[PDB]
Amino acid sequence: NSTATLCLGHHAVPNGTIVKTITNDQIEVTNATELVQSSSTGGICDSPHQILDGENCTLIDALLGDPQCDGFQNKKWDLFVERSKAYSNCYPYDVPDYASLRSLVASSGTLEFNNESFNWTGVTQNGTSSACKRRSNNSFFSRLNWLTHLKFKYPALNVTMPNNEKFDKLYIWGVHHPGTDNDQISLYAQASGRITVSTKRSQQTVIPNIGSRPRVRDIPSRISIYWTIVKPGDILLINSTGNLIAPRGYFKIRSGKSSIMRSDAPIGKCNSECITPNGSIPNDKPFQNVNRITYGACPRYVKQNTLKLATGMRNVPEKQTAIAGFIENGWEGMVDGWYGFRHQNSEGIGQAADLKSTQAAINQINGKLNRLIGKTNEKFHQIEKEFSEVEGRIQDLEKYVEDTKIDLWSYNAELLVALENQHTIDLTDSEMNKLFERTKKQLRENAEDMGNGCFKIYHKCDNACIGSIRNGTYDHDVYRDEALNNRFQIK
Amino acid sequence: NSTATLCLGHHAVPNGTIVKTITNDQIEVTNATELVQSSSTGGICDSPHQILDGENCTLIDALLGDPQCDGFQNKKWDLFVERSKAYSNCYPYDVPDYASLRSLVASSGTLEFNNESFNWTGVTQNGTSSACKRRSNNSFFSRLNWLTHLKFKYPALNVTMPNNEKFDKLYIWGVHHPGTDNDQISLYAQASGRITVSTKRSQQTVIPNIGSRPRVRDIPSRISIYWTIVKPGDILLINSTGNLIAPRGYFKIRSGKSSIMRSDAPIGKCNSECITPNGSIPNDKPFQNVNRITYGACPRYVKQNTLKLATGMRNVPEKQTAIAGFIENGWEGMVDGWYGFRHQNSEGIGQAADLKSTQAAINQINGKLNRLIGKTNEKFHQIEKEFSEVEGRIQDLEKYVEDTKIDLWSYNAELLVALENQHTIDLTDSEMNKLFERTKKQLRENAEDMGNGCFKIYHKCDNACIGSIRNGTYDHDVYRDEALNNRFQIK
Amino acid sequence: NSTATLCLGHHAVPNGTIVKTITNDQIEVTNATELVQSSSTGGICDSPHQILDGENCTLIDALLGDPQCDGFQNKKWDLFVERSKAYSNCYPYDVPDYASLRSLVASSGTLEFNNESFNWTGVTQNGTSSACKRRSNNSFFSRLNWLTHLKFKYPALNVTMPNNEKFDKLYIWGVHHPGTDNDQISLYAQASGRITVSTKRSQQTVIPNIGSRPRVRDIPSRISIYWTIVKPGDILLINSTGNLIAPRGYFKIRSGKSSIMRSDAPIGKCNSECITPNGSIPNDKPFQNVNRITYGACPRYVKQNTLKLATGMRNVPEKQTAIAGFIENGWEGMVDGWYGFRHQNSEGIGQAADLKSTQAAINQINGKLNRLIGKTNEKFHQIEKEFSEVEGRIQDLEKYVEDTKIDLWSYNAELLVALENQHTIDLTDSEMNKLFERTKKQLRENAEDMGNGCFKIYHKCDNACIGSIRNGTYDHDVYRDEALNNRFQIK
Numbered sequence A, B, C: 001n002s003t004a005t006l007c008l009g010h011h012a013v014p015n016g017t018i019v020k021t022i023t024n025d026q027i028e029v030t031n032a033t034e035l036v037q038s039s040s041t042g043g044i045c046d047s048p049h050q051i052l053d054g055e056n057c058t059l060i061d062a063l064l065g066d067p068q069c070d071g072f073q074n075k076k077w078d079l080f081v082e083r084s085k086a087y088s089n090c091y092p093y094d095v096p097d098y099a100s101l102r103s104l105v106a107s108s109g110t111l112e113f114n115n116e117s118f119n120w121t122g123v124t125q126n127g128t129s130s131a132c133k134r135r136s137n138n139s140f141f142s143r144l145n146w147l148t149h150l151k152f153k154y155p156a157l158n159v160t161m162p163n164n165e166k167f168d169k170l171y172i173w174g175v176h177h178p179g180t181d182n183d184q185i186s187l188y189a190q191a192s193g194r195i196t197v198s199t200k201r202s203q204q205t206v207i208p209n210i211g212s213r214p215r216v217r218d219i220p221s222r223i224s225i226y227w228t229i230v231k232p233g234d235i236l237l238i239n240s241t242g243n244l245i246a247p248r249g250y251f252k253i254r255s256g257k258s259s260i261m262r263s264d265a266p267i268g269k270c271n272s273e274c275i276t277p278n279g280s281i282p283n284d285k286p287f288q289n290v291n292r293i294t295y296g297a298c299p300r301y302v303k304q305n306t307l308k309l310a311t312g313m314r315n316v317p318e319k320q321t322a323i324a325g326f327i328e329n330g331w332e333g334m335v336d337g338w339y340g341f342r343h344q345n346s347e348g349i350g351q352a353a354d355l356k357s358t359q360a361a362i363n364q365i366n367g368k369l370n371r372l373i374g375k376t377n378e379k380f381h382q383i384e385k386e387f388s389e390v391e392g393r394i395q396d397l398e399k400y401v402e403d404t405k406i407d408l409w410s411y412n413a414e415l416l417v418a419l420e421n422q423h424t425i426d427l428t429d430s431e432m433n434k435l436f437e438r439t440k441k442q443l444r445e446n447a448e449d450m451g452n453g454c455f456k457i458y459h460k461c462d463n464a465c466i467g468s469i470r471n472g473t474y475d476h477d478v479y480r481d482e483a484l485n486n487r488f489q490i491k
């Protein structure tokens, strides 16, 4: 009657979410946000990276100049996309260390080609084949020059091309392995012999090996492809007596952020920074479980399919009914703040949100969101992470490196979220405790702690009086005489 | 006389253990558990993984079919164990990229072999040697076919074997390098010439090189071993004019969780999930310092030989003697709880454990144990981590990858244990503080804090009264008049 | 008048430093220390590691014995330093897998060479060239022996060298590729043919390839360099009919902590444990941003250029003026302690530092400094991390491994510093709170909390009385009657 009650409390919601902390495997909080990206739209967005869709062509087919790849001449990319349907449709070939040539062209990001005038005096140039049709005519790789005898002579070639440019030159060349001794003589006028391609700093010698291989598009012969990089001030020398598939010039070789990806995802007219083989993915979240193959500003790949970051305090049911405070009890009816006051006095029972404490909690949570959301880092050309052939040692190491990396990031992600969630529970608990302590200090000897998050105020404390406490302007001296008389009375 | 004392406290033990936290390099707690496995039984348990003990045979010798390895035909394994005593006892051979063939067969996990009928018309089959005895008779590798001239002719071989199966085929074949020109002619009727083994997608040409090597089991010649994998719908073509050591068929090549390990540990009849070269190790702990080479569900390798996880609160000696509470003081005599009450009243001096607070602490500690104990993850075929030969670049990278991984896990382990131990000290301190605070709130104006973890209760508080406080049913109003009179009296 | 005031507080400084914690991106503390080393002196200190400055010689040139490298014979190193100005000045050569031979010699750490007496009966030894002058005379690599015909005969060589030592032998040898058929005959009396160098466990066959390469120091021919390691109990066999560049003996091959580094930094007479290409760096700090290439006891490379570790409490401005305590308020005038007391009584206004709380904070901060400062770990030979040529697959993997490692350490560093800084703020806040709580408990019913970190003491409390509180010897009973009368009076 001659007293009032003031309770300190916090909000609660009817639909909380479970998160993990250091203390609890499962604790319900008022709200959380997902930190693992697990979906893609399923398309690769054509912006803001320059995409080159290989369609039916591998990068190596586009490099050599398979007729169906003619439209790729001189093009550049940030990301070359190779399709599973891609197929070769020219003379059958192989590339010793195919993976390396693919990688180095991919990383260079350009098919720019400059023709050069080699001196092929004494031989027939521009050999063609029915296995490599261009506009329904017998043809050959656009960037290569099939040399054969002239008037049944093939004089020894000893041909030079200096690099007088200020940039490196990439030369692609080949050796023809004929199916039979008959074809060797028919083509090069004499028995097969080695090809030597050299510079001041390197030498490569290749021996043609005559023999039938299983027919590919009806051809039992093969071309083996080689490459040579020539520095400024160095000189290419080509030395051969037959079987040379000659370069027509050089590719520019650049450095930058280009790569290549295997994917069947359609290319869309849209804008997304992070590309995976499954399609582009949003990069707001710090982690993702879509694909360990990525290009661009991407979330880091982890094994988890979900990691929930708490964005609110512990969610605690309201106890069924006298008003009561935060001790084992949240307030579902408090909707305009996270913390606040309930009172009972001469004028009724009321509630008010505390703005300061609410904002302190929200600001800290927004702070950690700002550290974690929209802060992905870019990666470009990396290592391959899926393999179509069995290879042993090198592949074992590539796979182990990647597995090692993923487990370490998955661990970091698990620990980070547990630590942050513990900190969020701690900081939100702390704001409640601080509010209660501040109030206790204001009240001095005029109130007692009832043990339920409420004070029994031992004087008449009307709406303005309660407001003075909430506003931090309550003068304990004004009421102390009244309060002491009420507290320390014999009953 | 007209008062009582109620002290809040916690247990202590005479034999505490030192752990590390974020705050302290060394702090004594009541109990701890070891998180680094540092011993092995010294034997490899034959369950639950399928173990194949190579005995005197390497995997490659068992593959080729060295007579002493005949018992291995067609066997499978999860883990092939190669012994240091193993030795070859057939024709001397080498394998270019031995490590890769070993790895790929190891990972495949099967020696299943299917014979095929190759057409070797025109040559003598089944050549043998005194260097490869089988049942005291001259013999040869079981899976290989040594072809030699027939009637002093060796017609050119051009032999095909299509893969019309729905699975890949692994072919193992070889080239014989004779010791002398005499042996070349004696065996193959003509001067040495290249061997070409091809498919639609690959080609391998090998040149026999005649010459003496140092004698091995009295043989100066050598066989070099090669392999070819043939896909469904592809075709093996073998083309040769001498020196061919032919396949008799193909190996199945499978994918799964198989590997190979070098170890001299005996195989025992027992059951253990984690295998190391030192023997099987228990996998209850999250870390281990036994060996960085592992197979199965294993603790992670770290450099530390011990990491102790606190499983109890700070251990604090009892001060020598009036009762006293937890302030700089533990209770060795409290044995039925971790926290509790001591009192002095009209009826004597008593102690009671507080079950709730004790269980809260124990449950949280059991929670972190459940996260850390018995939760190891499986790894299977990885990379090699010990090397018998000097190799340079590739080996440097294999070693660096592993060193990198171990240092990162060792760091994670060190930080994890420090963080968890800090949290355990914090949570156990917290339960003590909470118990004291709850009691303070119950007592209201009827008691004062004596500063030593005890309350001076300013009314007669008999055994039932004390029990009411411990049980949370104490009604402060019943005693308030008495208590206020005693507290606020002029003396 | 009949009362006193006692305030609890902590120091503040006029020049605080901003650090990052888990709670705050930016919080000012009284002091911090830098954990990332970002400068070098710019010189490589010649102590305590044994440094070998290659000057104009690569390690491989010093190994082969280019005349300008004669002074390097038989020398050892912990770190061989290769200079960008280095150049070859003998016969032009290449080394297939140059990187591996460089690495394995580097890691071995010795050029110790033992001559052996090979039986080269039937040929001319010690061939020389004007391209390799020694003391103005035609010469050749010191460790190699250029064999040519004798009286226009080159008999087949078949030469043996057993390893009867208890250590491994490293043999370096070569093949001469002549510029023309004329030179082949002039030098070796017959058409070129293979060289085979073998042991019981290995074989290497190399084919000389006649032809012009672009002239290097006027020479169109080349030597290709090979190596063979021979175990105890094994035997080297060299078999050749021309073009052999023979070994004169063997190199010791050792194991230990040696490496090689590319750097143009001058060598100084000074002592530093950590070497980078930029020069030696101090190793007090746990991290560094100078270079990811390191040798010795070095801080770990991270991407951050600064990480500041808090070494003091939150720095909080003093509020402008009655004395006041720590609530939103630090004391710039407290200079002999971190925490303490201010009082107002009958005898004036005074301040005293609290030694215990100050020392508790300082000891804990010194503890974490001792864990982090001067505790670097040693690494020696690793992998290469900069590349002068484009190579593809292997280089992609080397770069990815290193990028992976650096990002993981950079993450660990960021989290470590945030966690430690949070802990430092927490522990320093805690000492303040504990001091306030201890004081509150001493005062019992004789004082009230004014809400600003101060107590109103309700009795006359002169300088000695205040001292008794600070010293922990205050007897509340002495003053309780006076204090209760003053507190609970009607006004």
Ligand SMILES: *[C@@H]1O[C@H](CO)[C@@H](O[C@@H]2O[C@H](CO)[C@@H](O[C@H]3O[C@H](CO)[C@@H](O)[C@H](O)[C@@H]3O)[C@H](O)[C@H]2NC(C)=O)[C@H](O)[C@H]1NC(C)=O
Pocket: A179, A180, A212, A213, A214, A215, A218, A220, B158, B159, B160, B235
């Ligand atoms: C070595 O053996 C090879 C496999 O037996 C063989 O290749 C096969 O050659 C035949 C006959 O030339 C091809 O069959 C083709 O014959 C008719 C001719 O009218 C064509 O119109 C058809 O396209 C038909 O396919 C096979 O296609 C071919 N098989 C493979 C797997 O390539 C080689 O010719 C033999 N080598 C030598 C030098 O004789």
Ligand SMILES: *[C@@H]1O[C@H](CO)[C@@H](O[C@@H]2O[C@H](CO)[C@@H](O[C@H]3O[C@H](CO)[C@@H](O)[C@H](O)[C@@H]3O)[C@H](O)[C@H]2NC(C)=O)[C@H](O)[C@H]1NC(C)=O
Pocket: B179, B180, B212, B213, B214, B215, B218, B220, C158, C159, C160, C235
């Ligand atoms: C090239 O030189 C090789 C090493 O000198 C040589 O190998 C050696 O050959 C001898 C003689 O054949 C072997 O000695 C064996 O001789 C008796 C003959 O009754 C045997 O009963 C014994 O087993 C005895 O060991 C050596 O073992 C052998 N040494 C090595 C290291 O292999 C080659 O024969 C020479 N090559 C040519 C083509 O002549």
Ligand SMILES: *[C@@H]1O[C@H](CO)[C@@H](O[C@@H]2O[C@H](CO)[C@@H](O[C@H]3O[C@H](CO)[C@@H](O)[C@H](O)[C@@H]3O)[C@H](O)[C@H]2NC(C)=O)[C@H](O)[C@H]1NC(C)=O
Pocket: A158, A159, A160, A235, C179, C180, C212, C213, C214, C215, C218, C220
């Ligand atoms: C294959 O072609 C090569 C390049 O055209 C050629 O090498 C060049 O040879 C010429 C002439 O021998 C050298 O020129 C030198 O000639 C005078 C002779 O008095 C010297 O005094 C000078 O040093 C002058 O440089 C070139 O230096 C050389 N070019 C290169 C790039 O090496 C080969 O000789 C040809 N091979 C064959 C077998 O004929």
Ligand SMILES: *[C@@H]1O[C@H](CO)[C@@H](O[C@@H]2O[C@H](CO)[C@@H](O)[C@H](O)[C@H]2NC(C)=O)[C@H](O)[C@H]1NC(C)=O
Pocket: A156, A157, A158, A193, A194, A195, A196, A239, A240, A241, C180, C181, C210, C211, C212
């Ligand atoms: C590299 O080119 C040279 C020519 O510049 C070739 O050498 C000639 O070879 C023919 C027969 O093949 C001989 O009749 C000539 O006498 C050689 N000329 C000279 C100047 O020596 C050489 O064969 C070529 N090498 C290769 C591997 O193709």
Ligand SMILES: *[C@@H]1O[C@H](CO)[C@@H](O[C@@H]2O[C@H](CO)[C@@H](O)[C@H](O)[C@H]2NC(C)=O)[C@H](O)[C@H]1NC(C)=O
Pocket: A180, A181, A210, A211, A212, B156, B157, B158, B193, B194, B195, B196, B239, B240, B241
């Ligand atoms: C691959 O097989 C073919 C036969 O199918 C070999 O070619 C024959 O070689 C002999 C002499 O070696 C010649 O007399 C024949 O004229 C060739 N036959 C045909 C049909 O061309 C060939 O030598 C084999 N290749 C290898 C590398 O062993």
Ligand SMILES: *[C@@H]1O[C@H](CO)[C@@H](O[C@@H]2O[C@H](CO)[C@@H](O)[C@H](O)[C@H]2NC(C)=O)[C@H](O)[C@H]1NC(C)=O
Pocket: B180, B181, B210, B211, B212, C156, C157, C158, C193, C194, C195, C196, C239, C240, C241
């Ligand atoms: C390895 O050495 C042997 C000699 O020990 C060489 O074999 C001789 O070769 C010549 C002609 O080159 C023949 O006239 C002899 O009959 C051979 N001697 C014997 C004992 O067989 C052989 O050529 C050498 N090999 C190489 C690759 O150089």
Ligand SMILES: *[C@@H]1O[C@H](CO)[C@@H](O)[C@H](O)[C@H]1NC(C)=O
Pocket: A031, A032, A033, A311, A369
């Ligand atoms: C939950 O948290 C997120 C992140 O702060 C916020 O965007 C979202 O609106 C919140 N949801 C509710 C219902 O408050």
Ligand SMILES: *[C@@H]1O[C@H](CO)[C@@H](O)[C@H](O)[C@H]1NC(C)=O
Pocket: A055, A056, A068
């Ligand atoms: C790719 O090849 C397929 C199959 O021949 C063909 O139908 C399609 O038109 C080709 N696409 C392009 C873009 O050339």
Ligand SMILES: *[C@@H]1O[C@H](CO)[C@@H](O)[C@H](O)[C@H]1NC(C)=O
Pocket: A038, A039, A040, A277, A278, A289, A290, A291
């Ligand atoms: C992405 O593709 C990979 C590889 O095919 C597949 O494992 C994964 O389920 C895909 N993820 C999504 C979200 O589509």
Ligand SMILES: *[C@@H]1O[C@H](CO)[C@@H](O)[C@H](O)[C@H]1NC(C)=O
Pocket: A463, A464, A465, A466, A467, A468, A470, A471, A472, A473, A474
């Ligand atoms: C602010 O303080 C005044 C003065 O005591 C008080 O009457 C008023 O109700 C307060 N306003 C609030 C709590 O909104």
Ligand SMILES: *[C@@H]1O[C@H](CO)[C@@H](O)[C@H](O)[C@H]1NC(C)=O
Pocket: B031, B032, B033, B311, B369
């Ligand atoms: C110490 O802790 C472990 C793990 O909880 C427990 O199994 C063991 O019994 C404890 N020892 C004692 C003496 O309490």
Ligand SMILES: *[C@@H]1O[C@H](CO)[C@@H](O)[C@H](O)[C@H]1NC(C)=O
Pocket: B055, B056, B068
């Ligand atoms: C392995 O070889 C040794 C030495 O010859 C022999 O004593 C032993 O019986 C062999 N073991 C088996 C299982 O064949």
Ligand SMILES: *[C@@H]1O[C@H](CO)[C@@H](O)[C@H](O)[C@H]1NC(C)=O
Pocket: B038, B039, B040, B277, B278, B289, B290, B291
């Ligand atoms: C296991 O074997 C390794 C390699 O021989 C050795 O370094 C280590 O001491 C062994 N550990 C134990 C516990 O036996």
Ligand SMILES: *[C@@H]1O[C@H](CO)[C@@H](O)[C@H](O)[C@H]1NC(C)=O
Pocket: B463, B464, B465, B466, B467, B468, B470, B471, B472, B473, B474
């Ligand atoms: C439980 O509460 C009752 C009622 O006050 C009390 O008398 C009794 O002793 C308590 N039991 C305990 C503490 O075991």
Ligand SMILES: *[C@@H]1O[C@H](CO)[C@@H](O)[C@H](O)[C@H]1NC(C)=O
Pocket: C031, C032, C033, C311, C369
């Ligand atoms: C700041 O901290 C460092 C590390 O403890 C200490 O050496 C230095 O003297 C301190 N500076 C000041 C001004 O206290």
Ligand SMILES: *[C@@H]1O[C@H](CO)[C@@H](O)[C@H](O)[C@H]1NC(C)=O
Pocket: C055, C056, C068
């Ligand atoms: C290194 O070579 C340069 C350029 O020829 C020369 O001037 C210098 O004397 C050489 N230095 C040494 C130490 O031989």
